[PDB]
Design an enzyme around this catalytic site. Structure first.
Site, PDB file in Angstrom:
ATOM      1  N   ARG A   1       0.846  -1.166   0.000  1.00 24.29           N
ATOM      2  CA  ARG A   1       0.000   0.000   0.000  1.00 24.29           C
ATOM      3  C   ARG A   1       0.887   1.224   0.000  1.00 24.29           C
ATOM      4  NH1 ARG A   1      -2.840   4.760   2.872  1.00 24.29           N
ATOM      5  NH2 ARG A   1      -0.582   5.081   3.014  1.00 24.29           N
TER       6      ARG A   1
ATOM      7  N   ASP B   1       1.836   4.845   0.233  1.00 24.13           N
ATOM      8  CA  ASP B   1       1.327   6.010   0.908  1.00 24.13           C
ATOM      9  C   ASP B   1       1.577   7.295   0.133  1.00 24.13           C
ATOM     10  OD1 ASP B   1       0.410   7.612   3.432  1.00 24.13           O
ATOM     11  OD2 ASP B   1       2.534   8.226   3.151  1.00 24.13           O
TER      12      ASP B   1
ATOM     13  N   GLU C   1      -2.264   5.477  -2.416  1.00 22.46           N
ATOM     14  CA  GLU C   1      -3.246   6.340  -1.792  1.00 22.46           C
ATOM     15  C   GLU C   1      -3.277   7.721  -2.417  1.00 22.46           C
ATOM     16  OE1 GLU C   1      -2.178   8.857   1.044  1.00 22.46           O
ATOM     17  OE2 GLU C   1      -4.154   9.121   2.021  1.00 22.46           O
TER      18      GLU C   1
ATOM     19  N   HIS D   1      -8.282   5.412   8.485  1.00 17.98           N
ATOM     20  CA  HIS D   1      -7.623   6.086   9.581  1.00 17.98           C
ATOM     21  C   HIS D   1      -7.504   7.577   9.385  1.00 17.98           C
ATOM     22  CE1 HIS D   1      -4.898   4.981   6.531  1.00 17.98           C
ATOM     23  NE2 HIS D   1      -3.906   5.715   7.026  1.00 17.98           N
ATOM     24  N   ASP D   2      -7.931   8.060   8.230  1.00 15.70           N
ATOM     25  CA  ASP D   2      -7.850   9.476   7.938  1.00 15.70           C
ATOM     26  C   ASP D   2      -9.187  10.191   7.987  1.00 15.70           C
ATOM     27  OD1 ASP D   2      -5.014   9.416   7.613  1.00 15.70           O
ATOM     28  OD2 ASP D   2      -5.202   9.389   5.386  1.00 15.70           O
TER      29      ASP D   2
END
Ligand SMILES: OC[C@H]1O[C@H](O[C@H]2[C@H](O)[C@@H](O)[C@@H](O[C@H]3[C@H](O)[C@@H](O)[C@@H](O[C@H]4[C@H](O)[C@@H](O)[C@@H](O[C@H]5[C@H](O)[C@@H](O)[C@@H](O)O[C@@H]5CO)O[C@@H]4CO)O[C@@H]3CO)O[C@@H]2CO)[C@H](O)[C@@H](O)[C@@H]1O
Ligand SMILES: OC[C@H]1O[C@H](O[C@H]2[C@H](O)[C@@H](O)[C@@H](O[C@H]3[C@H](O)[C@@H](O)[C@@H](O)O[C@@H]3CO)O[C@@H]2CO)[C@H](O)[C@@H](O)[C@@H]1O
Ligand SMILES: OC[C@H]1O[C@H](O[C@H]2[C@H](O)[C@@H](O)[C@@H](O)O[C@@H]2CO)[C@H](O)[C@@H](O)[C@@H]1O
Ligand SMILES: [Ca+2]
Ligand SMILES: [Ca+2]
Length: 686
Positions: free
Chosen positions: A227, A229, A257, A327-328
């Protein structure tokens, strides 16, 4: 193995991702918990370490929590070594409990575990048919201040213990010193600091090589996916070269992301997902889902638009990683809201196209606002919740019903609050009905499906007030009432006769590399694989089975190809497109053109003698180039992924719409480095 095996690191479409915030999951080894002001075993102070570790994960894997849910993959926090300093942001203490403040990519975060622990995690996981995905943040190190070297850890970068450099007195130029981004432009958010994080300079050979070496380490450790970032903050060119380094080594499903807001649609985002070599986290999907199921700021029509639009904007929609929260952002479930809302969004997601991801705690009805309120310790490991059962009942479908994992999406019934959609792939069908309306039931008539005549039971077993479906001739469903807040899942599976390609990965690589073609009806005997018109058979086809085929990319010219297969009997399959064959190993090169004056709306592009450069086709030119941060107009720059050690011919062009203006004189030339980076500075020729 079959497309569904745990060994398939190229396809997650049949899996269900369980996103875990390591520190907030489970503390299986208190011995490694940080100490002093950096710790809080009670987990009351969300900015401190709570003690969550890898051992904890292992236990949850072994005790049946994850398996019982149907989860087939996990996405854990960045494993690398983070800063140790306790940062004070205006009286508030902060730690790297999130693992995003890297200090050494070649080491592990002691709080999480040792390399041995990590290795055990992989083993435990694999043993339970669970894929392991790691978070990777190569955009930066940690928070720093060039003036206050004493602040934090000065964003220092270590190479397996050896100090590489810090933010202060960066003579080597490992970082960017252009201040922080204001998010105004894409270029802006790329060559500027994300908040106060020390921005890495990928144009620096040291950084470039280091980063590629580091990922290799983790690959060697057996990770199944990555993933990426903040991909929205890194040069697209560099990222491509990074993906190649991966794909040409040990390919693994990778998704970045690219943060998208509400109602925000980005063409850049689309382009990236289609040409970077990596897919993305489906923010567009997430945002829309929240609007419709959570905030009621849009209806089913909006949902439908999103589905059709996305299906057209993304070359590989099935590779996008879906979600409803993270989580954001604020937790989906509001402490005072109706649970059915969350359950519905879940069902929808699990049965929709792409790779579904569930943020830890969802199944536990966890509530919470923005960071860090959205990262509380998981209150309990109860299998008794309704949400838990939904997942349990729906997850497995992705593995047994190819329609769900690879099928197309089609609206069959719709209104303000209702949506009945159909997933189709070969001889497999799935029909999902959703009634967001919590107070009013809906009368459904005129429903037409691809289901064969018969009676279908709700896969959810009435869990969400679903009902039995009666299908007559012509796939016409009998009149029925869709209960308020009702959600039903009906499906039909059957053997597929003709070869049908459902998925391919990697999507970008050089000849010699083995790719994985997944689908149905491939037959048990080796057929033929086509890369454009080029045929491939025999030896090069390493493995062939009904659901999967493993083949080596033929040594064809670098370019974009269409993939197709034929069974031993000579029956051809559908066409999977957008396959990119590299010209070889890649390196990141920075192109700079001086004195390229233009008019408003008119931009500069780059073209050249290689596929990576569009092969002289202006329609495939690289750009538009940048001219704000690193260099300023009339100077233009851009980071491009080109074939290593290759002598390339290139020229620049001015574009206005589809109207192009070529650079004068003769072509420019240069030989791409064999490794590391380079900078090419030339003057625009009239
Ligand atoms: O998100 C980033 C940004 O990207 C895109 O902008 C780029 C432009 O598309 C591209 O043309 C380029 O712009 C150059 C421009 O080519 C160059 O001529 C120069 O522009 C001058 C004008 O020449 C000058 O007349 C003046 O413009 C007047 C304009 O005449 C008048 O009609 C009205 O529009 O007011 C303007 C006042 O500014 O000023 C500019 C600045 O000197 O310089 C430009 C670059 O600085 O590069 C752009 C990216 O850097 C998107 O189109 C844009 O929306 C995005 O913001
Ligand atoms: O494929 C045949 C042809 O391809 C290659 O030519 C490319 C040129 O090298 C390249 O410069 C570019 O040419 C443009 C000129 O630079 C520009 O001034 C103006 O004349 O438009 C031209 C494009 O139409 O593109 C061509 C390919 O289209 C190769 O180098 C040649 O040897 C070969 O004949
Ligand atoms: O009968 C086929 C027809 O079904 C669906 O139309 C629904 C419509 O969405 C509802 O709002 C309501 O009007 O009932 C219709 C069926 O009578 C499909 O949306 C439509 O494409 C299709 O032709
Ligand atoms: Ca611990
Ligand atoms: Ca950056």
């Amino acid at each position: 193995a079959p497309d569904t095996s745990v060994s398939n690191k190229q396809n997650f479409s049949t899996d269900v991702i369980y996103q875990i915030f390591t520190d907030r999951f489970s503390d299986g080894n208190p011995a490694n918990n940080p100490t002093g002001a950096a710790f809080d075993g009670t987990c009351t102070n969300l900015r401190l370490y709570c003690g969550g570790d890898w051992q904890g994960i292992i236990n949850k894997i072994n005790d049946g929590y994850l398996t019982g849910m149907g989860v087939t993959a996990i996405w854990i926090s960045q494993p690398v070594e983070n800063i140790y300093s306790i940062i004070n942001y205006s009286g508030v203490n902060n730690t790297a409990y999130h693992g995003y403040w890297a200090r050494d990519f070649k080491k592990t975060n002691p709080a999480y575990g040792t390399i041995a622990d990590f290795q055990n995690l992989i083993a435990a996981a694999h043993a339970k048919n669970i894929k392991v995905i790691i978070d990777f943040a190569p955009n930066h190190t940690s928070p720093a201040s060039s003036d206050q070297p004493s602040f934090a850890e000065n964003g220092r970068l270590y190479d397996n213990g050896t100090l590489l450099g810090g933010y202060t007195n960066d003579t080597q130029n490992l970082f960017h010193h252009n201040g922080g981004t204001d998010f105004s432009t894409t270029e802006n958010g790329i060559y500027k600091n994300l908040f106060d994080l020390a921005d890495l300079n990928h144009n620096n050979s040291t950084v470039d090589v280091y980063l590629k070496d580091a990922i290799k380490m983790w690959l060697d450790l057996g990770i199944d996916g990555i993933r990426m970032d903040a991909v929205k903050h890194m040069p697209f060119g560099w990222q491509k070269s990074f993906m190649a380094a991966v794909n040409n080594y040990k390919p693994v499903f990778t998704f970045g992301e690219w943060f998208l807001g509400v109602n925000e649609v980005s063409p850049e985002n689309h382009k990236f997902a289609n040409e970077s070599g990596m897919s993305l986290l489906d923010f567009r999907f997430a945002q829309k889902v929240r609007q419709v199921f959570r905030d009621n700021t849009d209806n089913m029509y909006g949902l439908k638009a999103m589905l059709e639009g996305s299906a057209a904007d993304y070359a590989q929609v099935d590779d996008q990683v879906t979600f409803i929260d993270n989580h954001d952002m604020e937790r989906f479930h509001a402490s005072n809201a109706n649970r059915r809302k969350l359950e519905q969004a879940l069902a929808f997601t699990l049965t929709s196209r792409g790779v579904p991801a569930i943020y830890y705690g969802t199944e536990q009805y966890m509530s919470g606002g923005t960071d860090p309120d959205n990262r509380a310790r998981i209150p309990s490991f109860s299998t008794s919740t309704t949400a838990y059962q939904v997942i349990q009942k729906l997850a497995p479908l992705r593995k047994c019903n190819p329609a769900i994992a690879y099928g197309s999406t089609q609206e069959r019934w719709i209104n303000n609050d209702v949506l009945i959609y159909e997933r189709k792939f070969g001889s497999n069908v799935a029909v999902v009905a959703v009634n967001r309306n919590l107070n009013a039931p809906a009368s459904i008539s005129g429903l037409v499906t691809s289901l064969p005549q018969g009676s279908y039971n709700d896969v959810l077993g009435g869990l969400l007030n679903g009902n039995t479906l009666s299908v007559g001739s012509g796939g016409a469903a009998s009149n029925f009432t869709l209960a308020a807040g009702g959600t039903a899942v009906w499906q039909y599976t059957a053997a597929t006769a003709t070869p049908t390609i459902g998925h391919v990965g990697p999507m970008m690589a050089k000849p010699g590399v083995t790719i994985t073609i997944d689908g149905r009806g491939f037959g048990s005997s080796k057929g033929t694989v086509y890369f454009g018109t080029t045929a491939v058979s025999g030896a090069d086809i390493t493995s062939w089975e009904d659901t999967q085929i493993k083949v080596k990319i033929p040594a064809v010219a670098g370019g974009n190809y269409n993939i197709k297969v034929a069974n031993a009997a000579g029956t051809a399959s559908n066409v999977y497109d957008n396959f990119e064959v590299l010209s070889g190993d890649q390196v990141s090169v920075r192109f700079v053109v001086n004195n390229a004056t233009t008019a408003l709306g008119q931009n500069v592009y780059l073209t050249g003698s290689v596929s990576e450069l569009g092969n002289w086709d202006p329609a495939k030119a690289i750009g538009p180039m940048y001219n704000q941060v690193v260099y300023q107009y009339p100077n233009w720059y851009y980071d491009v992924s080109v074939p290593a050690g290759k002598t390339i011919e290139f020229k620049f062009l001015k574009k206005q719409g589809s109207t192009v203006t070529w650079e004068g004189g003769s072509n420019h030339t240069f030989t791409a480095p064999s490794s590391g980076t380079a900078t090419i500075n030339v003057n625009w020729q009239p």
